[PDB]
């Protein structure tokens, strides 16, 4: 067939490729620029949205769905990210493991205990998957263009990240609507 | 032009129309678009590329892994031209013709059929002949005259069939590129013959026990009587 049966796997020692370092037909790194997103005070979900769209490549006029060309976003200060009201305490994160006992219902607070970075990664996952699910390479490849640093110290001085100046137009606080 | 008929082949193979098969065209192998079903648009260069280059390699093609024939050797092509001569004209017949027209009508047509065919396949081999005069060998330069003689055809140096062009009007003639068809045969056979005489004297100048004595007696004798039959000297 076109796509092979013998496939690169997580248990297979060859390992899983990093799309930043990969060279493929649909990956263009030539015209990208680096952004700096300070997350102090900004709501988690909104930051996730903006980052998702710079990362995905949707902020460009010439953006094409099958051609993945993103900007690298360095998201700084994940720890100061603000989730409105009771939501830290009330907003679930649910996943289902395939095995007897398929429910993990885990509060934002617990995920924040383990890693703050995983929260931003989670909502980035959501905002990217909102337009891309049906193909793995289109889901996974953008996400590696996020650099999640939970405070103001990052390795990336050499890329001269341009401060991304953004104000959220939405006045009201974020609202959790998931069926 | 890949699958069906090569550069120096003797087939006339029509690539676009399948005239040799036993079955209707069921599955078209090279196809680009799904609109190829009801209007394949073959005849465009870019689609007949895709069709003709997807055909299986023939006995003519000799596909990549398989070892192919050494065709462009002059030493193959000349006995090839010669085996055409024994086809139309039988040995007996040849003898009767050698003597000196009283011949069976039926028989006569075989002589002119020999002339016809020999003309044709000279037309086919000359693009491979013109490649090879350079490394051709002393016996098979002479074979060029032997084979024309045996087929009862006189070579144009300025009976002979090789002098005239086949008639047709230049607007109606087939000029399509990629098909190797030399439109001036009597002009390029003539300067093939002159060339192959000129090379012969080179190798006879190059060639100057009893084996070499008898050989150099005999083939030197064969030169003037074979080139003399076509009216050429030296």
């Amino acid at each position: 067939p076109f796509k092979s049966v013998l496939r690169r796997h997580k248990h297979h020692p060859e390992g899983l490729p990093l799309y930043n370092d990969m060279s493929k037909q649909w990956l263009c790194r030539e015209g990208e620029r680096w952004w700096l997103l300070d997350a102090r005070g900004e709501q988690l979900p909104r930051v996730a949205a903006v980052a998702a769209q710079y990362i995905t490549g949707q902020h460009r006029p010439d953006f094409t769905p099958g051609m993945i060309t993103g900007d690298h976003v360095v998201i700084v200060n994940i720890k100061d990210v603000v989730m409105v009201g009771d939501q830290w305490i009330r907003v679930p994160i649910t996943w289902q493991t395939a095995y007897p006992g398929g429910k993990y219902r885990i509060r934002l607070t617990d995920m924040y205990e383990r890693d703050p970075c995983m929260l931003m990664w989670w909502f980035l996952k959501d905002e990217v998957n909102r337009h891309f699910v049906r193909k793995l390479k289109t889901r996974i490849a953008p996400l590696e263009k996020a650099w999640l640093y939970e405070d103001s110290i990052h390795p990336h001085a050499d890329k001269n990240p341009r401060p991304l100046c953004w104000t959220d137009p939405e006045v009201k606080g974020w609202k959790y609507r998931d069926p | 032009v890949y699958g069906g008929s090569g550069r120096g082949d003797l087939l006339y193979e029509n690539p676009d129309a399948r005239r040799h098969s036993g079955r209707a065209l069921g599955v078209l192998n090279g196809v680009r678009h799904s609109s190829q079903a009801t209007m394949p648009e073959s005849g465009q260069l870019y689609y007949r590329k895709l069709i003709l280059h997807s055909r299986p390699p023939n006995g003519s093609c000799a596909g990549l892994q398989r070892h192919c024939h050494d065709t462009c050797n002059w030493s193959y092509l000349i006995p090839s031209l010669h085996r055409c001569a024994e086809s139309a004209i039988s040995a007996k017949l040849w003898e009767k013709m050698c003597q000196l027209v009283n011949l069976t009508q039926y028989e006569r047509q075989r002589v002119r059929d020999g002339q016809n065919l020999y003309r044709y396949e000279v037309h086919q081999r000359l693009p491979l002949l013109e490649e090879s005069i350079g490394w051709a060998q002393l016996d098979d330069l002479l074979g060029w005259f032997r084979s024309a003689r045996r087929a009862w055809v006189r070579l144009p140096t300025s009976s002979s069939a090789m002098s005239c062009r086949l008639e047709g009007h230049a607007d109606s003639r087939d000029t399509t590129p990629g098909r190797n068809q030399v439109f001036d045969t009597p002009e390029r056979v003539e300067q093939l013959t002159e060339a192959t005489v000129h090379r012969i004297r080179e190798e006879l100048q190059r060639l100057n026990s009893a084996r070499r004595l008898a050989r150099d007696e005999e083939l030197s004798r064969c030169v003037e009587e074979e080139l003399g039959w076509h009216g050429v000297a030296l």
Binding site: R33, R60 | D171, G178
Partner: protein, 155 residues
């Protein structure tokens, strides 16, 4: 027809002069001289034969053959397929789509690259009343007036 030259060169027309299926003979009679007088450059070669191919055929200037099945088709139809032969250069068949409307892509001003609009920042129509600035005397008086006003109403 590109740069004043027709891309069609030959039209092959095969027919049977005595046998049957009159349509091609009709076509030769009533519609062909109207075609030849209109497009003189196209060489039409006629092929009388006993069992005729009933298809029309064009030959273009890149060495491309194009043919249309004319079997028991009216000479009106044959004339029309002929005029369809002339009107094509037979180079391509692209679909009719939005991305295929323009055959080649070109920019007169230039193509968008990420760095042309990058170094622009938002600006203001009228100039800014800077926060840190030396207040003029009228300004002093007005602002102190305001502060004293709100302090007065509060107290």
């Amino acid at each position: 027809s590109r740069n004043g030259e027709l891309c069609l060169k030959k039209v092959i027309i095969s027919y049977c002069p005595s046998n049957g299926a009159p349509n091609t003979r009709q076509f030769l009679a009533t519609h062909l001289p109207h075609f030849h007088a209109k497009y003189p450059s196209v060489s039409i070669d006629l092929r009388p034969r006993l069992w005729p191919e009933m298809a029309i055929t064009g030959v273009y200037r890149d060495g491309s053959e194009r043919s249309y099945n004319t079997k028991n088709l009216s000479p009106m139809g044959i004339f029309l397929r002929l005029n369809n032969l002339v009107s094509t250069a037979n180079d391509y068949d692209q679909p009719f789509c939005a991305s295929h409307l323009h055959f080649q892509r070109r920019s007169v001003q230039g193509t968008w690259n990420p760095w042309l609009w990058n170094y622009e920042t938002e600006r203001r129509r009228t100039e800014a009343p800077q926060w840190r600035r030396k207040l003029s005397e009228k300004e002093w008086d007005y602002y102190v007036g305001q502060y004293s006003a709100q302090m007065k109403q509060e107290e």
